[PDB]
Amino acid sequence: EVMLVESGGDLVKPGGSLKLPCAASGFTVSTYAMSWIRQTPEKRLEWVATISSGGSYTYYPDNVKGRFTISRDIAKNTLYLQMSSLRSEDTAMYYCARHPPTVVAGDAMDYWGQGTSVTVSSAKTTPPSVYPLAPGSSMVTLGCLVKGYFPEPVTVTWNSGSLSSGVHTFPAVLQSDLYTLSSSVTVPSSTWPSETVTCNVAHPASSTKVDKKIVPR
Amino acid sequence: DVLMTQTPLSLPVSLGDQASISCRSSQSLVHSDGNTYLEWYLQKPGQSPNLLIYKLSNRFSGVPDRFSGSGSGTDFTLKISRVEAEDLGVYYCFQGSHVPPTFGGGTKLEIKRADAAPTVSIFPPSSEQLTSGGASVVCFLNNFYPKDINVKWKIDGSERQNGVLNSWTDQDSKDSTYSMSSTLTLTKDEYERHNSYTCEATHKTSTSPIVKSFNRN
């Protein structure tokens, strides 16, 4: 089916630069109007840019105008977003979207890509510290504290993935430009410590991988 | 920029019921060509938004049945009869009439389900973390419904707010319960001043709070 795959997201310093591509499969780019739309960490969706179905026109709301450029390459069947002179307010998820003919969906957007994530910040990239959470005293609950990494994202698994029922992983919280999260896991108490539970944490950005056996204090 | 004001950001609704998300615009969204370029989108957890309605009262291809766009001028109503598990997510209204195109802040569609008391777990700091010089006290409050919950920390019988971090999950898409982590973060020294640490939850499932604690020894 129709598929749009954004890529290029990254962490960059304020006043920096970078280019997102968005690759279309399932339809030709050269025959559709296409926009970039962004969603801020706080879930607010705002307009970024648009290119005309015939490719001769472009729009940018005033806050990105003059700093951003939407281009299309009909041969590559790919949409671009050149972003220069970046501001921390630009930190958001960048979705790539198409508009079908007005006869099909009143100029609305029928398909949206999956997003790439951009972070405008000067904060330095930092691997996480990983700590077990075992109880000190029927259904035993455990966890991983993943403290002081940046930038997002971080991936947390249990026994290399074999353990998924009874897992919650809480959104990261940002204090002092470093993130912290925790994951919980539940398991019958009988399987403890018969089965050594390990949380596995990866922080791609810093080439960090840490497995961490939870043992009982 | 036309303000798109939407957001009861919840309505609580049991499966198979009526649901009415409203959206109010800054001014009339009636285009100079006597159209209404008002659109409705649903963002399911971990996804891009999906088009539901375009042009005020027009259901998009494949978009069910029970979805219906009503309204005019400044006030709009998306109206879901029935309400299935699949309808969970955040609904946005959207305006195309006025030249910086704008979104609403979204209404989350909360699914009603039987009340569940939270499962509270409290965890002293890891010894590894203590060696590094910090000490994080973590409290998990898991699989409860409704969303409304009070967490409260107590150190040696004494309430404390400063230095508490909270994280909430979105409604779980499988069992529609909520969960939450709460962290008190302290320096080793700071932590070791006090003996007993408490984490107490107040949820509508109980008239008296749920209490979990421990001592340093």
């Binding site: 025959t31 109007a33 179905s53 015939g54 026109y57 007005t102 | -």
Partner: peptide, 13 residues
């Protein structure tokens, strides 16, 4: 081919 979006998008240019 610049004719598929009559309606609100046209407004953006």
């Amino acid at each position: 081919n610049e004719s598929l979006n009559t309606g609100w998008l046209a407004g953006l240019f």
